[PDB]
Every structure is written in structure tokens, then in C-alpha cells.
Design a binder for this molecule. Structure first.
Ligand SMILES: C[C@H]1N[C@@H]2[C@@H](O)[C@@H](O)[C@@H](CO)O[C@@H]2S1
Ligand SMILES: C[C@H]1N[C@@H]2[C@@H](O)[C@@H](O)[C@@H](CO)O[C@@H]2S1
Lengths: 626, 625
């Protein structure tokens, strides 16, 4: 029933798509572009005037219109967005490659929220002609898929920015034991600077990207910690590593220029190579030769300061001030916390966004890139962080969160507080809320039974009912979550598992020590087989979730991890049985006293911690090393 | 049997060894003599047996039983080429040899002619005040190490711990506590010059000093990035050959404090001082390093290790390279048991014969046979007995003419039957002189839907080879006595491989041909059966492991095999979804398979070397962030 005047055909088609998310009421709306504001909406009694500064801003304007019209007839909206560009970057390199259909849904939602820009982070997960091992069995996007994704974003006047790697974070590529790949290597996950075959590869990266319309790219260059120290050192000897970086940076910028690209890079290696203790968060002594080189290069690249951790504006401001010593062409990357296992932390994301937004505004930052990393196997749902995305959008357009829940429900059908219950498996009640990375969702799940190396981080009196209540809270939200139900069903089941598994290893030890054989038998014969049944159920839900959002490729690692967990539970059953049958004097596993897993949060009152590597969660034995 | 001339200690040791060998009802006069390593004369039921060194009595007895089984008259005289022959067991790759198996190993080593038993322990021995060192790894207590040693002493066999004082400490340094992290340079390497590192090393030697032995191998191999991590950040750039010497001096000073005499792997001197970072190089020694190194080389024996060469002259070249630095050298050879589930006694033989030639020509005094367990310790500890008997024969006789007979006396199997244990590796079109080709492992752990090693499979030959191996090994199991477990495990493995070698390919063929009957059959019959077979193999493997090793470290294999099983279920479920019409394609099967590696791409055969579980099993990330 909605009637619009002043739209192009492109804008009317975009709106039809968006009717799949939002419900437009029966009113008349005159639309025009105007520089007066990012978004303005006025009128009453069913006749409204809507203006946008930039085309893509029509779609957030419509979300605002729908929302405000439910509680009032008169409308006085005026928004002035703080940032020239607000982007969302999805991790497609951690095993989870967003599928094209899910990319389109994400684009639609981002448009409704007010984002200008959609980005995919692809280390090796885009195809390059003549590089058959690059993205092999990883579900690398074809050039056609990226074009499709980008053209879809272009239907909403949302631009596309690929985030690639031109130095390090190429582990999945460089592992292939063929001459054509090994000759490109320096050390660990780092390409060999100065090798012409490496610049042939990088040229090929841009040949693929040049098939897109976009001429904006993030070239990576973060976290190349041993750059110059491997095969580079053997071949070339000791060199000034700050200058090595500039040299490599210059070659890459020249290749980009060849294709007409404008580059951004992560900023951290400048700080780590030019500070005394090799850290990001440092004031730097720039050697003069490097200063002269950076002075040239700074006019050709945007440096991206990334920080997901600080709880105050001042901390951000300090780093911004450090960055100004190098360059005033800066962007900021904030965090949509979805990289700590199975379960996001939209809560923590909200806490730090508020403070990062203050700092970005103070330093006239042109662009914020919200980053959804998927560290260590991509086990968190791609749509798990919609609340964090709306949060950053509200902060840009309105500089407050007053409209957050209403805008969110208009866009998704859920209140933001219901949706943010998705975080529950991380939200142990005794955590302060301002400390990052505390991820019991993941380490309680993948921990062994017989050898429970995180057991000192468990607080069963608190944790068991928290997890138990969370599973019920989430089944209730699932029932009202519409097409988002899958996300909550997955989390409810996980929480149900963690309710019992959080201390099953401890109860086995207490029974063993107390010589309570009836209890060991109960655990071995009833509880553990049921635990496997529940984990299998969870695996089925996870798989459904994964196949909805992502390509099939990379799910294999989760199959392996979860099958291993299941087999280790069976071991706990069988070892207990052998003991019960009188054919073991002792169960040696249980004779070992448990130590703290890590001391990272050892001085806090709470017991939980951060453990975010599957292979160290699951076993104290060797598993990847030789 | 009746002996004269024995001590109480000797008569006690012979009692134990009757558990392995059958002494005939004969009269033997025993005396020490310097005339030969071993001598045996006599006839008509009366024999004279001499030995040079006490432990050599036990080889002599194995010899006597053997020769008497087809002759009344005996004329034996052996002169061993090596002052010491040792076997070193890897107890650091997850598999920690349990005490009961240590005792069986010592007994067999005694019968073969070995003077020395060694255990390689990175973090798998207990250090007071270092609770994370060996944590949940089954680290030997001092009491256990003392027990293993005293048991070896019963046979006049000496004990030498092999430890790590620089790198190869990855299982220790992973632990994210300040007490451990402060000790780190980079990767698996300790931080040279950090006093808490030297506190740790002092603790290592405090544990070992509880032993009687005062001989130790201090490690120091393969510290490739030494100086380039935290060391570089804290201290800046330094001469890495001088850095090495500094650290080596600290370590030898600690050893001296506790009375130890040290050996070390020699590779880092060559790698740090060669231009291309390689071991097999004649190196120019920087002047300051030469001064430092000349001091140090008088305090440590260098161990040249090499397992891979089929020619004497390659060994000799490296001996020459070593002699430019020092003449205080020992040699380490290999009993190949570090390439998965299945050993390579055949390749071990090939290289032993040539290495023995080179060692003799360079007047090497001690040979250490090394039984590494790379990447999870999945090969059985007693899988390499033939390789051990080979080195013993090469030392004492300089040939293998007595090999099978002495082996049979010692184990109950002919050496030919025992070495069938290798079969999962012995693909028919391989030449026998190329190292590391291990289809036993990569055929087993490969995925079904995404078979990244498929190009290395030759089903026309591999399939019957493996099927025929399973039958052969089932026959040998039946005559193998207490070694039956070893063959039973391998028989089941070969049975699995005969179908798994191409199941991934046949799924792909069926899919492309649109042979849905065959996709159904594979999904509903063959793959569930394959899982049942793998579960049985897991059961057999577990039995073997728990018989030979401590329980710790089996968890990794559970994890790995658990994951394989779960991936086979995924193969089944993805095919069913396709068959039900709920996918237009199975994307996994649309990917063209490339060579896994080009390491042996120049050769006529398709097989290769692939010895990392995590890269065998998936092309996705799995340990990286
Ligand atoms: C520049 C980026 N490099 C890293 C990225 O790959 C993620 O692992 C992320 C979250 O852990 O941390 C940093 S931010
Ligand atoms: C000095 C030793 N270092 C390595 C050892 O740890 C094993 O990995 C072995 C077999 O691959 O290779 C070498 S020999």
C-alpha cells in the first residue's frame, strides 16, 4: 500500500527486495536527494517528505520511517552521519566462506542499517589464474561469484571492498609442498619479499580483483612477525626491517597502481618493527631513512588502526596520536566479536564500540570498518553479530543507542535484547563485562573428559544453572525468531550440553577418589552416552547452520574436531569400564592433578579464562607438531 | 643346561633370558677373555664360551643356541667394530614406553649385542618445581628412570638419557603461563641467555643425577630460528654461531656441575655456519666462533645423524665435514618407525649396510640406532626388531649371513616373516632406496569426499597389494607368539587400505557417470563397513599402544581416528542428501584433484611422502588462527 514519488526504477526495485525484511505501511512518501542531511524525514497524517544525502541512505531512511510510524503519526527525523563510510568486513579465510545467497541477505541488512560498504576478507579464498593451489579445496570465490556479490551490493548503492593478503596470513596457501609455492616463502605464513615470483603472484591477485568495478582494496600486511628472518635472511642477510617493509609496500602499491586500485592496509607492522618491545600499542622511534620512505608512501595508502579491546576513549586516542606521527590518512577497524568459538560477544562489542566511536570522532576518522573475524575454524554463525552491526550504525548516524532496539526489530523481527541473548554461553555471571576473549562456550565444549585441562576455570555452582537457564531462554527466543531461529536453536543446544559437561570430568574424579563405583558406572553407562547423543544433535544443528550461511568447504575441520571429541568421550566410557571390571589397578589419567590452563586472568576474582585454539583445548599431547 | 664360571648376577640374567631363548641340555664353560668380543668352541655336548665385555655373554648365548640347532661342533669368533652399540627409543612423540616394555626391550637388546639403551625425552621426565614440564604427557618419574636403568644394569647394559636443552620442547613451551613463556625465544626453542632457562636446565640435570649413569645426550638439533624471536627483540642482532657456543658453554657447565659427560646432535653447527642453512656442508668457521668452538669441542662428543642415504660415499663426505671440526664423533643410524603406523625395516637394512661401511672407514667408536616417532608415535615400539638385529650383526660380523637364524632364536620368527610387518609401505613399483614413502599413513587418514592424495594412488596395483598383505600378515600373526599383536594390527590396516585406497575415486567416478546405484551402495554398504573396520583397527591399535606405552598420548590418536570416522559419515550423509534430490551438486566432488606434493614427481611411481596428520586429513585450516 505504500506510495512513493521521486524514485528511480533502480530504487523501486531495491525497495521491493527490502519488503522481504521490513513492512512498509500505507502512507505517501516523497523522496529526493538533498545535501541538507544524511537522512531527513518530515510530515504527518500519512504524507511524508524523505531526503537522503547519499543514495544508499534511502534504505536506512525507510527502516527509520517504518519504525517511527508504529508509535506516532508526526515525524521529525534528521540524521548526520559521523563517518564518510561505514563498512562491514566478513571473515572468509578461517574455513567459513560466506555463500552467495547469504552474502545477498547480509547486503540487504547492511543497507537497511546504513552501511555504505561491504567487504570480504580472503587470504587465499579467491581464485587466481595460473595458481591452482591458491584456495584449493577452500571454496575460493570465482571471479564470477565476486562480481555477482558486488553487483548485488551495487543494486543498493553499497560499494564492495575486498580485503586480501599481500604479505602474511597465507598459511593455507603456503603449506602446499610444490616448488611453485615453496619458492614464494620466507617463513611461517609469510611471502618472500624481493622474490619476483612473489610479485608475479601479487600481480595475479590484482588481475583477478581488476575484474570487479571497485578500485578500493585492503592489501593486508598485518602480523608478519618474523618478516625478513627466514629464507629472506638466508638469501639476503640482515637488513633493516622497517625499510624492508617499505620496499615491499612500494612494490605492492606500484602493482595496485597498474590496475588503478587505491589501497588500505593494516597498520600494525610499522609499530611492531619500530618500537622497542615489538608491540602495536607503542610510540615509535622512526629511523630517518624510514621516515623519508614513509613520507613518500603515506600519500598512497590509507593506514587502518585496528583495535577491538579498549574500554575507554583515551586509550584509543593515544593510539591515534601515535598514528599521526606517520600519517593523517587513517581509518579505524572496530570489532564484531564473532571469533571466539561458537558464540559471539555482541555485549562486549557494544561496550567497546561506544568508546571507540568517541575517539574516532575526536580524530576526524573518515571511515570505520567493522570486522567480523572468525579465528581458528570459523565456528561462529555469520549472522550472529547483527546487533553489533546495528550498534555501529546507530553510533555513526545518531551518536547514541536510543533507537537501537526499535530499529533492530524493524530490520529483523527480534528486539535487540532478545537477539543479544545469542551471547549467553559466554556470559558467566561473575565476569565484569569489560574484559575481552573470555570464551567458555568453546573451551567447555572441546575440553576432554578424562584429562580436563581447563577444569580449574570451571565454577559449577554458578555455571551449571547459568548454562541450563540459557538453553531455555534460547529455545523461547528461537520460537519467535522467524528465519533467524536456526541461530538460537544451535545456541540453546550448546548451552544444554555445557550445563552438564562443565563439570562431568570433575565429578568423574571425585567419584574415582571417593571410590564411588556406582557413580562411575552411572556416568559411563548413562551420562556420557547421552552426552554423545546431545553433541551429535548439536553437530547436526551446527552443520545445518553452516550449510545455510557458508560453502561446504571448511566444515570438514569441524567434522574432525567433533568426531575427535566424541571418540574421546567413548574412551572415558571404556577406560571407566575396564577399571570397574577389575582389569586396571588405577586410571592414570585421573591420578594427574589439574593445573591452571593459563594465567592470563589469574589475578581476577572469577575463574573463567580465554582459550581459543582447538588443538590446545582438546589435548596436552602433540597433535600438529613433528 | 649347566654352566660353569658364572657369577650370581650372570646366572640371574640367564634365568630371565630363558623367557626368550631355549638353551639346549648342554655343558658350557664361561670365562671373560680379551681375545675376542665373543668366542665359542667345543663339541659332543661340551662347549667353551668367552666374552670380552660382560653384556656380550648374552649375545654369545643367542649365538650358541642358534648354531647348536644344526651342528654339534662350534667354531665362533666375533670382533665387534663398535665400542658401543645403542638403541634410542623416542618417548617424546606421544608414545612413552611403559616400564614393563622397557624391560622386554632391554632383554632383547642384551641378546642382540647392544651395550646401551637410551630414551629420548624432550619434556617427558619429571623436574621438581616445574609442574608444566611433562604435564599430562606421562613423564617418567625419577623412580621409573632409576628402575629402567637398574634393570639394564642387570644385563651390564648402560643407560643414556637423551634430552633437549635448546629446541624440540614444543609440548612444554605451549603452556600459557608466565613461568613457561618467559623461557621462550620462538617456536619450540628456549631463550638463550635467560637465567630462568638455565634454572630449568639445572633442574633437568638435577633429575638425571638421580641416575647412576653420567653420560647424556643434550640434544640441540633443529633450532632453526634460534636468536630470531624474543631473543632478537630483547637483544638485537647477534652472530648466531657465537650465540650457540655461548649457550652450549652454559649447558656444559651445568653438566660438569653434576658430573655428566655430554653428547649432542651436530646439525646446528653446520646449519648456522653454512650459507644455505644445510647440514651436509663443509663450513667456513668464523674466527671468533672457531676460538670459542675449539674450547667447547673438547667437552662434548658430536653426533652425526643420518638415516637417508644409500651410498657409503655420501656418509664419508659428511664424516669428512665433521672431522674439520672434531674427531670426537659418534654416528646415529635409523630404525625407521616414524612414518605413521607401519615401519620400514627394509629401507633400514638398505641404509645400515652402507652406513656401517662408512663408520668403519672413519673409525667411529659408537653407533646409536634411533627409533623416532614423528608426529604422534603411531608405529609400534617393537615393530623395528629386525632393524635392531641388522645393526647388531653389522657390528659383530660385518655381514647379515647370521641375521635370520639369530633373529629367529631371539624372537621365534624368521627375520623375513617379521619384516612382512613393513607391508603397508612396500608398494610393488617403488625402488627400495628412496626414503619416507608412507602410503600406510596417508591412505588411512585421507578424507573420503576430498581425497587430496588421490593422485598418488595406483588402484590396479595397490588394492591387491594391500589385500594380499592382510592375508600374509594374518598367517604370520598365528605363528608370532607374544609378537602377534604387531601383525594383527597391520593385517587390519592392510585390509582397510585395500578398499580405502580408491573409495574416494570410485565415488567421484560414480558421481560423474551418474551411477546412482553405485553411489547408494557406497553410501549404505561400503562406508558403514569401512567405519566398522576402522573401529576394529582402533581397537587393535589401542591394545598395542596400551601394551607398549603409557596411556598418555593415545588421546591424540582417538581424536584423529574419531575425526576420520566422522568424515566418513559426512561422505555418507552428503551422498544421501544428493540421492534424495536435495542438492543439484556435491561441490566437494566438483574440485579437480592436484598432486599433493612434487617431492617424488620426477619418478615413475605415483606414491609419495606425506607425514603430517593435519595436512593429510584436510586442506582447511585446523591448528592455525
Ligand atoms: C588486522 C587483523 N589481524 C588479526 C585477524 O586476522 C584476527 O585474527 C583478529 C582477531 O583475533 O586479530 C587481528 S586484526
Ligand atoms: C637429531 C634428530 N632430530 C630429528 C628427530 O626429532 C626426528 O624428527 C628424526 C626423524 O624424522 O629426524 C631428526 S634426527
Amino acid at each position: 500500500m505504500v506510495r512513493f514519488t521521486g524514485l528511480s526504477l533502480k530504487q523501486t526495485q531495491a525497495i521491493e527486495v527490502l519488503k522481504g525484511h521490513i513492512s512498509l505501511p500505507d502512507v505517501e512518501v516523497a523522496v529526493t536527494q538533498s545535501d541538507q542531511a544524511s537522512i531527513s524525514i518530515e510530515g504527518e497524517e500519512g504524507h511524508y517528505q524523505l531526503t537522503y544525502r547519499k543514495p544508499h541512505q534511502l534504505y536506512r531512511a525507510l527502516s527509520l520511517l517504518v519504525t517511527v510510524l508504529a508509535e506516532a503519526d508526526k515525524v521529525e527525523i534528521e540524521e548526520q552521519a559521523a563517518y564518510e563510510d561505514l563498512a562491514y568486513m566478513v571473515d572468509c579465510s578461517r574455513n567459513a566462506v560466506l555463500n552467495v545467497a547469504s552474502a545477498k541477505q547480509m547486503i540487504e541488512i547492511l543497507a537497511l542499517m546504513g552501511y555504505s560498504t561491504f567487504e570480504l576478507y580472503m587470504e587465499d579464498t579467491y581464485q587466481i589464474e595460473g595458481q591452482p593451489y591458491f584456495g584449493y579445496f577452500r571454496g575460493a570465490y570465482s571471479a564470477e561469484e565476486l562480481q555477482e556479490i558486488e553487483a548485488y551490493a551495487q543494486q543498493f548503492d553499497v560499494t564492495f571492498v575486498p580485503c586480501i593478503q599481500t604479505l602474511a596470513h597465507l598459511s593455507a596457501f603456503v603449506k602446499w609442498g610444490v616448488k611453485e609455492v615453496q619458492e614464494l616463502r620466507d617463513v611461517e605464513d609469510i611471502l618472500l619479499i624481493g622474490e619476483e615470483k612473489v610479485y608475479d603472484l601479487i600481480d595475479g591477485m590484482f588481475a583477478t580483483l581488476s575484474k570487479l568495478k571497485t578500485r578500493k582494496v585492503n592489501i593486508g600486511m598485518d602480523e608478519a612477525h618474523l618478516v625478513g628472518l627466514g629464507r629472506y635472511l638466508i638469501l639476503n642477510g640482515v637488513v633493516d626491517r622497517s625499510l624492508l617493509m617499505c620496499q615491499h609496500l612500494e612494490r605492492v602499491l606500484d602493482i595496485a597502481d597498474k590496475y588503478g586500485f587505491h589501497c588500505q592496509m593494516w597498520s600494525d607492522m610499522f609499530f611492531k618493527l619500530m618500537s622497542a618491545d615489538g608491540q602495536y600499542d607503542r610510540d615509535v622511534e622512526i629511523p630517518e631513512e624510514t621516515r623519508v620512505y614513509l613520507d613518500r608512501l603515506k600519500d598512497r595508502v590509507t593506514l587502518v588502526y585496528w583495535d577491538y579491546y579498549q574500554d575507554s576513549e583515551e586509550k584509543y586516542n593515544r593510539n591515534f596520536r601515535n598514528h599521526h606521527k606517520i600519517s593523517h590518512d587513517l581509518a579505524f577497524a572496530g570489532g564484531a566479536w564473532k571469533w571466539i568459538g561458537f558464540t559471539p560477544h555482541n555485549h562486549f562489542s557494544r561496550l567497546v564500540a561506544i568508546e571507540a566511536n568517541k575517539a574516532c570522532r575526536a580524530n576526524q576518522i573518515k571511515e570505520v570498518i567493522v570486522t567480523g573475524w572468525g579465528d581458528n575454524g570459523g565456528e561462529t554463525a555469520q549472522f550472529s553479530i547483527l546487533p553489533s552491526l546495528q550498534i555501529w550504525a546507530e553510533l555513526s548516524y545518531r551518536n547514541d543507542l536510543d533507537g537501537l532496539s526499535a530499529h533492530f526489530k524493524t530490520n529483523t523481527g527480534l528486539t535487540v535484547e532478545d537477539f543479544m541473548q545469542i551471547d549467553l554461553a559466554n556470559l558467566l555471571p561473575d565476569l565484569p563485562g569489560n574484559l575481552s576473549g573470555i570464551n567458555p562456550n568453546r573451551y567447555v565444549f572441546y575440553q576432554d573428559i578424562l584429562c580436563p585441562i581447563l577444569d580449574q576455570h570451571m565454577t559449577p555452582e554458578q555455571d551449571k544453572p547459568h548454562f541450563a537457564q540459557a538453553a531455555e531462554t534460547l529455545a523461547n527466543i528461537k520460537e519467535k525468531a522467524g528465519n533467524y531461529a536456526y541461530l538460537f536453536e544451535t545456541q540453546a543446544q550448546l548451552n544444554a550440553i555445557l550445563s552438564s559437561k562443565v563439570d562431568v570430568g570433575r565429578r568423574i574424579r571425585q567419584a574415582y577418589q571417593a571410590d564411588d563405583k556406582e557413580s562411575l558406572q552411572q556416568i559411563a553407562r548413562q551420562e556420557l552416552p547421552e552426552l554423545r547423543s546431545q553433541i551429535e544433535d548439536f553437530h547436526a544443528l551446527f552443520s545445518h547452520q553452516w550449510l545455510k550461511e557458508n560453502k561446504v568447504f571448511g566444515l570438514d575441520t569441524v567434522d574432525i574436531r567433533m568426531g575427535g571429541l566424541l571418540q574421546r568421550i567413548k574412551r572415558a566410557e571404556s577406560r571407566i569400564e575396564v577399571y570397574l571390571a577389575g582389569q586396571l589397578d588405577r586410571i592414570d589419567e585421573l591420578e594427574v592433578e589439574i593445573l591452571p590452563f593459563t594465567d592470563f586472568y589469574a589475578d581476577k576474582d572469577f575463574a573463567a579464562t580465554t582459550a581459543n585454539q582447538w588443538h590446545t583445548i582438546a589435548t596436552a599431547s602433540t597433535i600438529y607438531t613433528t
